[PDB]
Ligand SMILES: *Cc1c(COP(=O)(O)O)cnc(C)c1O
């Protein structure tokens with residue numbers, strides 16, 4: 142940075158702290174990642190100066206000839222990456238991508254079937270404090286209480302009883318592969334649309350390491366950040382038949398002018414994801430998640446679903462007589478960043494929980510491999526089995542510093 | 547840029563075209579501006595890597611100590627700038643700022659009174675193709691057919707007849723000062739909330755050149771871009787009594803995680819607006835708008851409202867037997883960027899129009915002064931009075947090139 146340090150010492154100082162924090166800590170929050178310097182440069186471009194409401198070749202304002210090229214690069218690269226017939230790259234966030242799909246197919250008060258929020262469903266999948274649960278009538282399907290795998294017979298019974306206009310599949314804390322074919326079969330039985338929110342797994346889908354929901358869903362939403370390792374923002378993929386309605390839902394429906402500089406960064410991140418290197422990266426993410434899961438089990442931890450098929454895992458802490466809140470706090474003390482997370486059928490409230498969620502995308506981006514997973518699990522065991530020992534916590538602190546070098 | 551040109555030649559090439567376009571053209575679109583290098587550097591920062599859903603000191607996730615400083619800098623600077631009791635700096639856009647206020651005070655189907663969209667009201671003020679007009683029952687007040695000034699007796703009659711829960715004031719194409727005191731007096735009479743959307747005039751408010759709606763409105767929304775010359779994004783200002791509800795409306799209500807890098811850029815832009823230089827700039831904007839308005843009248847153009855009190859003007863092109871569409875297109879041919887815009891009581895549709903909207907924020911940012919306003923008006927007269935003359939258009943092209951150097 143050149144101009145910020147002189148213009149605004151206060152903002153520059155805080156950013157510099159954050160930069161250094163990102164390096165010093167072990168980032169295990171499953172939704173986190175680190176974007177490339179190219180992606181950041183695109184976001185720090187003069188493209189922020191352009192109003193481009195509308196779509197390429199169909200803009201409200203003139204002067205859009207070049208931002209049109211940028212948006213089309215993002216749309217075309219997205220379509221290659223995911224095999225979708227249409228992309229909308231304007232959503233400001235994953236929330237707004239979901240909002241727009243809901244706006245497209247639902248009237249106020251319509252019934253929607255989504256994943257139980259305590260079992261892995263997202264906030265935007267019907268929380269009563271979120272627009273989704275206020276605007277629409279959300280009903281929930283659950284996971285098996287023993288296997289913690291989605292109970293597809295429950296999805297079906299809930300669909301057949303409640304007759305949703307829309308079925309939502311996908312999750313923010315589900316460690317197994319989701320069967321989109323079964324979701325579509327259920328949707329078809331009850332004549333519901335199927336929306337898949339792949340925000341967490343989008344990078345793994347892109348790399349062929351999770352089944353693609355595109356051929357099964359009418360609508361696919363995602364964040365461009367998370368496993369996809371793009372800038373912070375949203376995207377919608379859909380069949381050609383909904384393209385016009387979806388585009389209209391985004392603008393003039395729910396947003397105004399798009400963030401053209403962010404859309405540029407999305408294009409960059411999509412270019413990166415189309416490369417062989419990114420597929421190698423994504424395999425290491427899943428490989429690291431499995432290794433970390435196995436190593437945590439070796440420490441004596443119980444894992445929700447008995448392990449992982451993707452980038453993330455949930456530790457059920459009940460055997461250690463710990464809340465997610467306590468674990469989160471003590472790990473923060475040694476420089477390891479997790480979040481407390483409800484486990485399925487959690488006896489605790491969402492503000493306390495019986496679990497922590499852990500994902501490997503961020504540490505894999507930093508170059509961590511299988512040996513590092515073994516060490517991270519070993520540190521977690523040390524900390525969580527010795528919560529009252531400052532000697533154990535200092536030892537962990539030093540081992541964390543050794544990993545971040 | 548260092549890494550983007552090598553990683554992504556295609557995206558870099560299009561950005562570079564846009565950068566050069568921004569320099570070569572005369573930007574007269576009233577919503578446009580050019581942000582500082584400091585603002586862009588903040589947006590291109592590593593802050594994009596942090597999930598910080600929630601609010602400073604009250605975050606979902608750990609590791610937010612430094613992004614908390616950034617958000618508080620933005621909130622505190624905003625409060626100084628505008629004298630508001632509370633700021634929310636998380637809105638992704640002006641649309642989402644408005645959306646959140648509507649979410650706070652209205653139920654589905656509630657009546658809202660806003661400015662007629664053909665007289666200057668915004669898309670998010672009740673367009674039937676926008677969430678506002680779909681979710682809520684919007685009624686409209688108009689301007690006087692001769693003066694083109696808001697008819698405050700119409701606002702009152704409409705309020706008293708329709709009994710809105712909410713009154714919206716503010717505009718995207720209104721060239722005069724808005725009387726917020728009268729809006730509040732009307733709101734109080736019918737027991738409605740008052741929301742002011744100051745997106746267009748926010749920079750002028752900050753500089754003391756437009757009356758501040760903060761003391762009169764329950765809620766003030768704005769874009770951080772436009773006259774305020776910030777990054778692309780939204781903001782909400784409100785009385786302390788609505789702070790908690792407004793914060794909850796933004797998250798977990800309508801958004802997910804905020805864009806912390808953009809929030810950093812907002813803080814930077816607010817710091818810039820607190821400086822004496824910015825007040826000097828904003829005076830030149832209004833001074834330039836008046837000079838340009840006078841000079842256009844000297845060319846024989848009729849202006850909606852007979853001139854301007856702010857940064858923007860509307861040319862009524864009916865006397866020249868031209869549509870806004872035709873004027874927009876021919877001006878594009880010589881390198882001057884305007885947009886067609888409905889004038890009040892326009893005999894044409896919104897896709898054709900009888901007017902062009904012009905604003906001075908962008909050219910003032912580039913250093914244009916009163917002499918440049920005289921020349922721009924002279925070029926506009928030349929072009930619009932000689933639409934069929936390629937000699938006149940080439941002469942204009944050359945005069946435009948002389949201005950952008
Ligand atoms: C993270 C996430 C979102 C939210 O996107 P934001 O950009 O934070 O609004 C939505 N759905 C799922 C499944 C997510 O994981």
Ligand SMILES: *Cc1c(COP(=O)(O)O)cnc(C)c1O
Nearest residue numbers: 397398639640641668717718745
């Ligand atoms: C530009 C504008 C908006 C829209 O903000 P976006 O950031 O484009 O969504 C809303 N209201 C008014 C009055 C505006 O001028």
